[PDB]
């Protein structure tokens, strides 16, 4: 709080200073007067320019916000990718007469797909809440939202309601109390609402609503001159796709007095701060919903052990009677011994779970649409030995026959696979079995019965090839079902290659096939058990070092894995990788193996098919060199001292010379590739200095850069050098008299080119940072080195500023450079060599040129008068 208040106060202070054109502040943080303490003219300018650009950004934002307030909301929402939905469910103006259940979610009409899950709310029979606790404290947060979900072309919230009570909402027949019957779905457009342009929590937008046919008072009574009506009643005979799309396209509905008051508010962030800063909208009793989708902010510890099962559609033949059988999914959770567990089904997000759950009922539909997603939560050890059954019970009109009739057909699904896998995500069909009632009840029997499409089809194929111990049963009927599975858990494995990494000892025959398939894997399943996969690869490359093609495919796979690690979506897990390196990384001799493999890689860089592979390898060199350094230090500490240090240093030097020849060979095919290679080249050599001799590393880099041609892509290599001296030149104890000549040579090449217009900024950053290292108090003695510097760092910059006296470029940078230079040197070195220049005519010319450039700098100085 102190830091943020200091920042905002200082920002508004400088805003006032500039708007009235008076003196501003320095050193934005921690003191604000620390700059005039001769700290750094470099940092002085840096503060100047950052303050100036902040001024420009603030004034343009002020000008934009003086007219419209649309950019601020979009920017705030784009700051992070973690948002939540809050509903202000005020009241329900309607009256039905039976218990009601609410189900709202997110559906994209353009994608024609649902996104989020649904939560249930108990409501009374006459527009009241059954639980008055939710009457007033109705605070709900629906998490898992990001920019990619907000970038949807049409964003709408789907709200469906299912009743609980009688089969008929009138007299005529007795019906069992406590059964599910859907009514209809309400959908509203929230595209403009989710943009956060206007924050109005009090406003309660009414939504018109449409549902299935329920009354026959005006539709049929008045029909004259042609009475011919032979039809039935449509109570629940609506496929959901067409009705949902029609409601979406619809703009207004004659609900005839039915609807509710709701307001949707977007609160950015997660439960960490919305439970503290958004307490007025997010209480402690707020329900939290996990959308069926991978998070955009893939942070560590985002624990999700939710198993989502979606019921979509299924064929239902009429059968012996013309009325299709009433189908209710009486499902339950069972273990390896078929024991029912309690509180395992969570139809609503934020509500208590139930041991058993039943589904909705339709009005004798051959092909009804369900859109029914349910969630399963089981212990990670227990879920490995769990199974789910789907018993379908025929429900009759009278309670006696409704409850007397048992499950006519039983379905089921295996939660695992015999090879170790689990149920793969995607659309799965179902086939039900009827008739016998004894073989489908004993738990130990149906453990090996067909319950999923993939296992059923593979079993029938095995029967076709070998009709021994497996024969296709005839108990199936003329119906089928279809399900959607999306298990967003943390311990599942929907990848045969995943277990293959886990248990390669069992099926090492397909090692080549698995290594080939390792490079198209989805990121989430990888990051789920990346640590285990990496180890397994380490063990494979350790114990099996005989096959070099195995080594090639393993290196390619690890390159792909570390590349996916390096993506912008997964910097959160990089600390996890660091910690796993520090705790479980047990490689001792793999460092030299990987070093030799990459030496082969660079020495064999001639293939055109190897282009992108080596490109990504050099992109991710940092992490692999981290692994190599860890393995080598582990070896050194295990054996105390290694005489293999000399040979591995020679290996690194051979890698250096391989890079030398890699740059020497023609660039026509590796322009971007070699540019990026130099771009990230010294990123890890910082930690290599911890393990190798700094003098040799520095001089090898000096030889490399002096070998870099003076013909192509100079600005890129100058950015490289910028980052180069930035690192470990502060480790100046052994890298002065060698690094300084290289800087001198590259700046001299920078000097006279007749095309150094974009070179000015690069050379500016260069000289800036070199002076930064020259001034550091953690350096020591720098007398003779600064002496040689000023021996060759004065006339050249004088000439450069003389050439670029034009006032359009960013001269003030070089102004700061030269002034820092002049102040930094003490009078002694001035007297020793700045005085000891060439002949009297030459020194007089020097003096007059200096006077000219001084008067030109002072003459019409072109700063921002601030």
From Swiss-Prot:
Residue ranges constituting the C2 DOCK-type domain according to the UniProt record: 304-488
N6-acetyllysine sites (modified residues): 679
Subcellular location: Cytoplasm; Cell membrane; Cell projection, Podosome
Sequence positions bearing Phosphoserine: 226
Domain statement: The DOCKER domain may mediate some GEF activity.
Similarity comment text for this entry: Belongs to the DOCK family.
UniProt function note: Guanine nucleotide exchange factor (GEF) for Rho and Rac. GEF proteins activate small GTPases by exchanging bound GDP for free GTP. Along with DOCK1, mediates CRK/CRKL regulation of epithelial and endothelial cell spreading and migration on type IV collagen.
Known partners and oligomeric status: Interacts with CRK and CRKL. Interacts (via N-terminus) with tensin TNS3 (via N-terminus); the interaction increases DOCK5 guanine nucleotide exchange activity towards Rac. Interacts with ELMO1.
Protein name: Dedicator of cytokinesis protein 5
Species this chain originates from: Homo sapiens (Human)
Species classification: Eukaryota, Metazoa, Chordata, Craniata, Vertebrata
Gene name as annotated: DOCK5
Shown residues within the full chain: 140 to 1005 of 1870
